Target: DgpA
Amino acid sequence: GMSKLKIGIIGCGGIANQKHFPALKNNADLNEIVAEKAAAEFGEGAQVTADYKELLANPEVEVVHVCTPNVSHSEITIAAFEAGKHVYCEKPMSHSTEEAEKMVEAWKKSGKQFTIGYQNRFREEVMNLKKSCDKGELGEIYYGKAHAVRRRAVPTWGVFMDKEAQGGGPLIDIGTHALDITLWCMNNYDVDSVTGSVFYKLGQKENGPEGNLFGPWDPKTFEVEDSAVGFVKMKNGATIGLEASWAINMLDSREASTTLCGTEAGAEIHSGMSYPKNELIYNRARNNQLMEETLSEEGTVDNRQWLEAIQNGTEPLVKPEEALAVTKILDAIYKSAKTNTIKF
Amino acid sequence: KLKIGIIGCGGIANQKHFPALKNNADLNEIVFCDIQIDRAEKAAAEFGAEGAQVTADYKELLANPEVEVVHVCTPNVSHSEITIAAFEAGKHVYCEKPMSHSTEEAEKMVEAWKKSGKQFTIGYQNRFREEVMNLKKSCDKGELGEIYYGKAHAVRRRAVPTWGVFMDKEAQGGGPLIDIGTHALDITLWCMNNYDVDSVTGSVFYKLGQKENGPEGNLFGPWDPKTFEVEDSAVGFVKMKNGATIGLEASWAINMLDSREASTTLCGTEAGAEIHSGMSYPKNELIYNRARNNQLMEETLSEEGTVDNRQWLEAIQNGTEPLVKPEEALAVTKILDAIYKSAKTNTIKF
Amino acid sequence: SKLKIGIIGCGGIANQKHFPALKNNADLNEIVFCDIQIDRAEKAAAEFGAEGAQVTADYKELLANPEVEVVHVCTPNVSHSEITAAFEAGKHVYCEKPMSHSTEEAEKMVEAWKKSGKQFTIGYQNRFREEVMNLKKSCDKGELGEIYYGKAHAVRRRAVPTWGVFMDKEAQGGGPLIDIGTHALDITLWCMNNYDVDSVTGSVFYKLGQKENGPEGNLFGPWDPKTFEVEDSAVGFVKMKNGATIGLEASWAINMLDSREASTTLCGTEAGAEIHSGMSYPKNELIYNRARNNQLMEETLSEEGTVDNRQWLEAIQNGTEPLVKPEEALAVTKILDAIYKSAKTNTIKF
Ligand SMILES: NC(=O)c1ccc[n+]([C@@H]2O[C@H](COP(=O)([O-])OP(=O)(O)OC[C@H]3O[C@@H](n4cnc5c(N)ncnc54)[C@H](O)[C@@H]3O)[C@@H](O)[C@H]2O)c1
Ligand SMILES: NC(=O)c1ccc[n+]([C@@H]2O[C@H](COP(=O)([O-])OP(=O)(O)OC[C@H]3O[C@@H](n4cnc5c(N)ncnc54)[C@H](O)[C@@H]3O)[C@@H](O)[C@H]2O)c1
Ligand SMILES: NC(=O)c1ccc[n+]([C@@H]2O[C@H](COP(=O)([O-])OP(=O)(O)OC[C@H]3O[C@@H](n4cnc5c(N)ncnc54)[C@H](O)[C@@H]3O)[C@@H](O)[C@H]2O)c1
Ligand SMILES: OC[C@H]1O[C@@H](O)[C@H](O)[C@@H](O)[C@@H]1O
Ligand SMILES: OC[C@H]1O[C@@H](O)[C@H](O)[C@@H](O)[C@@H]1O
Ligand SMILES: OC[C@H]1O[C@@H](O)[C@H](O)[C@@H](O)[C@@H]1O
Model:
């Protein structure tokens, strides 16, 4: 009935093939797919070139998915596709706040649709937590923690250690997932100030790579940080602690996680290298006894939801403003280098 | 042998001091003050040398020239007043872990000890705990490298102290930041050997303490949410001049799962560590984390009031330094105080 | 207003629950003693400020004693009726757990209470455990919804009581079904708040109690298989007029791995719950189970003998109801007798 939607993938390398294609193939029924393998392995129409402008091919495309490293995000998008298309940009909306704001402007005038690749928002336990906060079952949340820590899991295969493409280390690599979850469930985005510390300690150390989950790296060429910690004061008194790392001598490898302290109850999510099963634990007082409630994929869900928003004309879950606020906090943490607190 | 006057026979005189001095009886004998004079009496009949003294007025006990070491066991706003000439003019003093709730009054406390040529130490006994010493010994031997990220842990889901005036802001000066955070920042700063602050940022929370349902689940018991004058929690972010950052979390009531107190997390260049202690830990734990032979590994473990006390009495009997130095306790007091001052929603630069 | 208390039976529960808890609320009572062992009352009529104790070998005289206000029956299960219709002839009566082995003897115990204008409660102290109270309040708020399936756990793998007269039929009337099954059944019907029986089916087992090697492993040492005059276990299947169904298992000795007693399992329309307690459980447990935001979750916990005695004493004073109502205890007696009545190899309809 509904016409399939003609989709457009500009970059085609990791999250393009580790997520978008399969999500569009788990969901074929809704999408039209119009780095060689890609047109054939999942399309028939455009090519499998190596370029950027050989897209801009079949402008009859009505949706574009930019899975280009962070720097390309502002122009491989914005007027690029705001030229009149919908856009789904990848996990860090951009490495730079100024460029990030230059997209919500591009989209805000091309009144088409826009979302960002924050899929950890569709994890069943993440949704569980979002719903109980929206239901006010935690109360007013005044203290959160965004956990994006990796004892020794420096990614050694793609764009991630490139300070020019990606613009930073674990803080914008994985801290953006954790903080997105946190803010989103706290439903708090009014930032008052940001204090941060950024550590170059293990990345260029000689035995630094020793123990790394993905194998050794060259500490002589490591150009980003190995960890960072943030202190975020919200305009309502709520405070958010952040820690993000690819390599830190810390026991718990808990990433894409959050801890939430409300006036009525608490909750935390556990995920990452130290957790074979994701966990969600609510804590509260019930009948004058302290108690704990514990639990007894999201790639596809994220994408399907994306299409059904444009086809049906309604809002995609992760909203552009949300991802911009995540980019502005993480930029203000690196900005703390001025050994000063950034007021908003 | 050393004569001891005990100012304030509250929970701490009994729980820690009296049995500690006893076990160390070969070094001391005790002479008892507390405005509620009946608990000075009951205490005197249990730990009193023989013919003692049971004043309810502390300016009386310092008059007694047969007392040469005092142990200030009063609420915190008192610490400064006793223990300032009040004690220094009369004798050596052991003030409790808080020192002061005030930087300025703690400043005078240091000036008054010096100007008295007498010994001085604060009640930070959690450091003597063998796991804490193990870590300290290792950090001093460089076995964690340079510590660039530290966490001080002083959090309790619901264990607000109900046996005194811990919730009186005229007597305690504050709540959990100064009751229990002090213990953890100390262990953190002593292990890191870093008391040189540059910046302090903080958030203080008054949320669960005045909530009618708040006192629910509280070990220690129910409290009156209408007479809660202190915070239930605070969180901190301290940057040191070497660049190391320390995080602090303190609570008597927070809806968090992990009740870890008098504990630290230390992350360095060669290694890290974590001490676990609190209401969520029946056994105290120390874990080291390092990479050995291209493999990530963890090293775990397969009283303190007495050791602290003995060490103290011996230092005066022998003319030497007790472990807890007042400069250290003063630095903790300052940092804790700067956290509260980020009620100016400003980062305090040192 | 200290209440004058009389004790009929001084060993076991009296010496283990009553005398300690009576003492613990001494501010609301004084004791003024009996036992058939003329001397059994002494070690307590002297450890229990009876200052003038009637301390007698005959209950029927401790009853004519005018200075006795509240009579505690801690005698064996047969005596419960007699010593309780006699005391209702003037006194407030706390009879112990198995109100009676007999439905009729217990019905007689109630009319008497009514003809007395006095206070009546039963020793179902398990109701006062913090976690049993937790579940009851959740149920009462409808947080489990409609409870349609329940399980009463009164199972001991191998813990036959060998210290009293529990194995004697003429003194106890029954075995584990009314010795411990009564606790579990009471909790179960109390939190469902559903006492309207429709049918009881049951089975009673005489297998290990008179077996030669059944005493093997007994937690409380061996017993003589030729004196074992009751059942070692019994199971029951209770259907209620509202359609809810309760399962019951009770045992002193049965080859089941899980020793769970004084516990319950409730399955509701909105959520479920189970309580764990018994020789299998060093700590008591309470677990809620529900679907929350589309995921199956389980909510678990991160004394009572005195609480029971207090509310009972306080209820006498302010003329209010004790927590355990005689009608509820009678309901428990009737189901349990009906499990035995299935010696008719037939379902007993109510
Ligand atoms: N979990 C997640 O959501 C997640 C995880 C990984 C990466 N990402 C994000 O995905 C993005 C890409 O990471 P990655 O590992 O896919 O990258 P990748 O490098 O593996 O693949 C991207 C490729 O796009 C190509 N490309 C570059 N510039 C282009 C241009 N101008 N025009 C056309 N094609 C161009 C290059 O081939 C580049 O390698 C980043 O924004 C990263 O943050 C998201
Ligand atoms: N781990 C530790 O080292 C530790 C533990 C607990 C408390 N403390 C410290 O001990 C101090 C309070 O002691 P507490 O916890 O036992 O509470 P507490 O209320 O039981 O003790 C205070 C006692 O001193 C008496 N008092 C008040 N003012 C007095 C005065 N001018 N002169 C004499 N007596 C006075 C009070 O009657 C009271 O009995 C605090 O500074 C607290 O921080 C230290
Ligand atoms: N948790 C509980 O609620 C709990 C626990 C154990 C027993 N009980 C109940 O308490 C009762 C006694 O159990 P126990 O363990 O104390 O047994 P027990 O035999 O140790 O105590 C009963 C006492 O009653 C005395 N007695 C017997 N006949 C008497 C008479 N005619 N007049 C006066 N005194 C007489 C006996 O000498 C004995 O001292 C039973 O009904 C039992 O089911 C309740
Ligand atoms: O899941 C998000 C992150 O996963 C990690 O495996 C890597 O650091 C990146 O691929 C990515 O940024
Ligand atoms: O607050 C109650 C007390 O409990 C003790 O265990 C801590 O050492 C003290 O610092 C604290 O003040
Ligand atoms: O069986 C031994 C005893 O243990 C107690 O817990 C029960 O309440 C009694 O009814 C029982 O007789």
